[PDB]
A paper describes a structure:
Here, we explore the precise structural inhibitory mechanism of actinonin, which is a slow, tight-binding inhibitor of peptide deformylase (PDF), a metal cation-dependent enzyme. PDF is the first enzyme in the N-terminal methionine excision pathway, an essential and ubiquitous process that contributes to the diversity of N-terminal amino acids. The function of the active-site metal is to activate the reactive water molecule involved in peptide hydrolysis. Actinonin is a natural product with antibiotic activity that inhibits PDF by mimicking the structure of its natural substrates (nascent peptide chains starting with Fo-Met-Aaa, where Fo is a formyl group and Aaa is any amino acid) in their transition state.
Numbering used by the authors: 1 to 180
Amino acid sequence: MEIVEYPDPILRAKNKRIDIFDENLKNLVDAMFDVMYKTDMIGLSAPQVGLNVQLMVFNPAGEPGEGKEIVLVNPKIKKYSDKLVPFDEGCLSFPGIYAEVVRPQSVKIDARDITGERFSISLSRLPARIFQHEYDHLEGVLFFDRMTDQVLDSIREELEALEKKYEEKTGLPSPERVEA
Ligand SMILES: CCCCC[C@H](CC(=O)NO)C(=O)N[C@H](C(=O)N1CCC[C@H]1CO)C(C)C
Ligand SMILES: [Zn+2]
Ligand SMILES: [Zn+2]
Ligand SMILES: [Zn+2]
Ligand SMILES: [Zn+2]
Ligand SMILES: [Zn+2]
C-alpha cells in the first residue's frame, strides 16, 4: 500500500461509515496493523492508507506481541474530560514533524468492533492520546490544527516544505497552505 501524506486532499475529505463487516474489513485492519508496525507507529487511521472510511487501529505498547491490538469502527466521542494535558506528537502523514499538542486527558467512547457489535469504553493516559489523534483523522482534522500559534509557528517551514513537494509532483498549487 501507499502512505498518504500532507497536504494530500484525502486527509481532509469526509469519511464514510463502514456498514459491511466482512473478510475484506478483517484483511484491511490486518494490513493497517502491518503498516503501523513497519513504519514504527503506535496507531493508524484509514485515510492515511488512501481509504476514506471511519476505521482506526492502535497498540499503545507499539511492539509486536505486546500490549493490545485495539480496533474501532465508526466511533464517536461521547465526552471529553475537562482536564487538558500536553504531550509531544508525531504523524505518519507529516514525515519528521514533532510538536506539542494539548488534548483532554480522558475520553468516553462508543464504537463497533471487527464484526459490528456496538460497545462503549472509556480511555485515559496514552491510549486516550492515540485515540484522539486518530479520531481527529477520521474527521479530516490534522494535528497542527490543534497546536497553539506559538507551536505552529515553529513548524511552518516544515509544513511549507511538504507543500512544495506536493506541488513538485503534481505541478498544481498546494490544495492547502498553512499561510492561509
Ligand atoms: C501520540 C499520538 C498518537 C500518534 C499516532 C502517530 C501515527 C498516526 O499518525 N496515526 O494517525 C504516531 O505513531 N506518531 C508517534 C508519536 O506521536 N509517539 C511515539 C510514542 C511517543 C509519541 C511521541 O511523544 C511517533 C512514531 C511519531
Ligand atoms: Zn498481516
Ligand atoms: Zn499483522
Ligand atoms: Zn519502535
Ligand atoms: Zn517538547
Ligand atoms: Zn496521524
